[PDB]
Design an enzyme around this catalytic site. Structure first.
Site: not given
Ligand SMILES: [Zn+2]
Ligand SMILES: [Zn+2]
Ligand SMILES: [Zn+2]
Lengths: 134, 65, 266, 114, 46
Positions: A2-5
């Site tokens: 999520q959100e650059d992961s």
């Protein structure tokens, strides 16, 4: 992820993927002041030496530093040195509270001024954990 | 460092192939991909485990100590 | 023949490629989940390093040692490390294997998987042979030694499961397909101009007659006919891989029945 | 550092029995079964062969947290049908399917060459 | 057998004296290392 992961294959981690060797090279020396009063590398005695660390020194060998095969963790002292008084007191060099691993090797060599001088290499295999930055 | 023993995802045993790999190009004058085809390395996840890696341990061996 | 039907189209020492027919969709997925993740096998869980002088740090080498493919054909005779009663291991718990090597020549001598040496009792079991499939006669390459170095240790192979660690997993390389044309309409085909020409049709199409396209969509359809190929790793051949997966699945299911009949109390 | 030991995923720890039965409030005759150390491998098949049964109404399994290893299975069936008996019937159906498949595959295997 | 301190240039087994300087006679250099304790590691091979 999520959100650059991201999400990683646990088996591949266990297969060995993206595993790391992490070394630390602690250093110390004695003989600093001179005038024949001198810090001494030794397994200390708890009696009349009140500067001991939280970790005990059963892991310490006779001359105050442990061999390159001893698993270490927590606050287990690596180099025990004693500074004299005008009895002795502790100047031991513990391990960082967070890390843990294996002593890779231990080096002794004198300095240009003639000082006893030690470099201890500790090693750990660091596995890719959950919150590591990739 | 060392040749990986198995591909990190599709699990095939790949450790034994490496040496043959090196000879497979040498004497027969083949491309890398066909030499990977000879060792049954169909899946590219497996097929990427060898070629991607360079055997660096050789450079470590030259040191005496 | 009383229910699940299997046709085999090819098979080999390492591979078995086959149709599975007339079962629910979910069953094959659960079965491959089992054999990938649940079949018990044997590999190293402890290594007592004696002395090492090779370049590689023995953490690395221990990890390499865990991954050695150990033959576990009759392993159902063997008992788990945790279940058995030996103090931390004995000949009923574990199979010990020595290891030692030295620098013979200035030419670097490599340590293959072959030079492992069994120490523990076998009592007739076919457990602990590190299987080797290469033509030259020596499998996994673990380390390389110049003339100077020496490598001696003693690994203690134990029974385990693919769930805990990945060493104790025997297939990991299995194909899976169940619809050539998406007649079930489970997927939506991304395309630029035409779905078909921009998509290579599955090679398993020849057994299932293609749609004549004249007919509307069949709503009542479900997934029964599967095409897949299992790949051996060498620890267990494919035949015993699938069967031991099925057996572990039946045993896991029945463990619910046992805990349930126990749950009925006084 | 903080990871649960890998054996925590398939072996039941201290004081953790395999199953639990809880009747569901605000519902008709219905029950949740609290599994332990069980991945979706089992639950999805139990749900499928459960749904194939005609008499059962409601059959579902949810992974409360793939962090941990438990999933909850809820079932409701028409009155007079104990749902645990429906679970038992579905399980036995799965088991007989598996056994017949095993013998089928062995027959198909022994004939094959290479 | 027993080997208290070694050096890098030549792997010479030298048990060393107390109240002594750090010098290897055969090597000639002043660098020396410690050697593995007899207590052997227990390794979750993992
Ligand atoms: Zn692969
Ligand atoms: Zn035992
Ligand atoms: Zn020397």
């Amino acid at each position: 992820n999520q959100e650059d992961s991201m999400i990683m294959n646990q088996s591949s981690i266990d297969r060995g993927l993206f595993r790391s060797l992490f070394f630390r090279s602690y250093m110390d020396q004695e003989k600093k002041y001179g005038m024949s009063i001198t810090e001494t590398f030794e397994k200390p005695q708890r009696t009349n030496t009140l500067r001991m660390k939280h970790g005990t020194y059963d892991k310490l060998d006779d001359d105050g530093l442990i061999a390159p095969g001893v698993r270490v963790s927590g606050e287990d002292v690596i180099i025990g040195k004693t500074t004299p008084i005008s009895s002795k007191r502790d100047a031991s060099t513990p391990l960082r509270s967070t890390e843990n691993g294996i002593v890779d090797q231990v080096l002794v060599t004198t300095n240009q001024d003639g000082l006893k001088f030690v470099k201890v290499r500790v090693r750990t295999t660091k596995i890719p954990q959950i919150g590591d930055k990739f | 460092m060392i040749v990986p023993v198995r591909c990190f995802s599709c699990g095939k045993v790949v450790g034994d192939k490496w040496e043959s790999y090196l000879n497979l190009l040498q004497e027969d004058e083949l491309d890398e991909g066909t030499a990977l085809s000879r060792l049954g390395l169909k899946r590219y996840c497996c097929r990427r485990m060898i070629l991607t890696h360079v055997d660096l341990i050789e450079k470590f061996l030259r040191y005496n100590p | 023949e009383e229910g699940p039907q299997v046709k085999i189209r090819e098979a080999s020492k390492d591979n078995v490629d086959f149709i599975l027919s007339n079962v629910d969709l979910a069953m094959a997925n659960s079965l491959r989940r089992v054999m990938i993740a649940e079949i018990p096998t044997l590999a190293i869980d402890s290594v007592e390093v004696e002395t090492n002088t090779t370049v590689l740090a023995d953490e690395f080498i221990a990890h390499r040692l865990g991954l050695i493919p150990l033959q576990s054909m009759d392993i159902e005779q063997l008992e788990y490390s945790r279940d058995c009663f030996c103090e931390d291991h004995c000949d009923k718990c574990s199979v010990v294997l020595t290891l030692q090597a030295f620098g013979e020549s200035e030419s670097t001598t490599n340590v293959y998987s072959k030079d492992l040496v069994i120490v523990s009792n076998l009592m007739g079991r076919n457990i602990g042979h590190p299987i080797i499939q290469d033509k030259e006669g020596n499998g996994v390459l673990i380390c390389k030694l110049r003339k100077g170095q020496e490598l001696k240790l003693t690994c203690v192979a134990k029974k385990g499961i693919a769930k805990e660690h990945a060493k104790w997993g025997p297939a990991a390389a299995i194909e899976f397909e169940y619809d050539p044309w998406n007649k079930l309409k489970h997927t939506d085909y991304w395309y630029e101009q035409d779905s078909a020409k921009e998509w290579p049709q599955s090679k398993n199409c020849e057994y299932e007659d293609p749609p004549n396209e004249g007919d509307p969509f069949d709503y009542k359809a479900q997934a029964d006919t599967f095409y897949m190929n299992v790949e051996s790793v060498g620890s267990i051949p494919v035949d015993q891989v699938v069967v031991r997966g099925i057996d572990t699945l039946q045993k896991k299911v029945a463990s619910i029945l046992l805990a349930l009949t126990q749950m009925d109390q006084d | 550092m903080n990871a649960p030991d890998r054996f925590e995923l398939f072996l039941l720890g201290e004081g953790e029995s395999k199953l639990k039965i809880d009747p569901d409030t605000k519902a008709p005759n219905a029950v949740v079964i609290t599994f332990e150390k069980e991945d979706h491998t089992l639950g999805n098949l139990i749900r499928a062969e459960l749904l194939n049964d005609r008499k059962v109404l409601f059959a579902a399994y949810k992974v409360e947290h793939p962090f941990f290893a438990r999933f909850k299975l809820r079932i409701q069936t028409t009155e007079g049908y104990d749902p645990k008996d429906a679970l038992k019937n579905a399980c036995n159906s799965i088991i007989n399917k598996l056994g017949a498949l095993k013998t089928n595959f062995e027959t198909e295997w022994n004939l094959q060459t290479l | 057998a027993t080997l208290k301190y070694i050096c890098a240039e030549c792997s010479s087994k030298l048990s060393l004296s107390r109240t002594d300087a750090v010098r290897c006679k055969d090597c000639g250099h002043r660098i020396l290392l410690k050697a593995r304790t007899k207590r052997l590691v227990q390794f979750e091979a993992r």
